[PDB]
C-alpha cells in the first residue's frame, strides 16, 4: 500500500509512515537505507526489488487564536507543522 500512513513490516523491519516511489538506486546487496542520526529513510521491496522512500505521516501542534472571551467567543485554529489542505 502506497501514499498512506501505514504500519509496515519489511522482512522484520517494523515502522510507521507513508511510502513513496524513490529516485535513489541501492547496490544489489543493499536492503536498508539509513540517513544521519540512524533514521531509516528507504527500503527495497523483497517481492519486487523496488526502492521505496519512507517518511513519517504528518504531526504537529495546535494553537488557538482568540480575541478574548470578554469580547467574543469566536476561535481560530492553527495547525503548525502541516498543510491541512491534505490533513
Amino acid at each position: 500500500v502506497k501514499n498512506k500512513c501505514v504500519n509496515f513490516n519489511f522482512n522484520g523491519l517494523t515502522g510507521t509512515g507513508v511510502l513513496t516511489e524513490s529516485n535513489k538506486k541501492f547496490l544489489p546487496f543493499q536492503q536498508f537505507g539509513r540517513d544521519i542520526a540512524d533514521t531509516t529513510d528507504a527500503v527495497r521491496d523483497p517481492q519486487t526489488l523496488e526502492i521505496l522512500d519512507i517518511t513519517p505521516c504528518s504531526f504537529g501542534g495546535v494553537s488557538v487564536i482568540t480575541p478574548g472571551t470578554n469580547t467574543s467567543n469566536q476561535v481560530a485554529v492553527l495547525y503548525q507543522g502541516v498543510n491541512c489542505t491534505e490533513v
Binding site: 504531526f59 504537529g60 501542534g61 503548525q80 507543522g81
Partner: peptide, 23 residues
C-alpha cells in the same frame, strides 16, 4: 550567500521575514 546551512521536535519560523528586516 556567505553564511548558509523528527521525533516531536520542530522549528517555529521567525515572526519578521528577511524581506521586512531588509525594509
Amino acid at each position: 550567500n556567505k553564511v548558509t546551512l523528527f521525533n516531536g521536535l520542530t522549528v517555529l519560523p521567525p515572526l519578521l521575514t528577511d524581506e521586512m528586516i531588509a525594509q
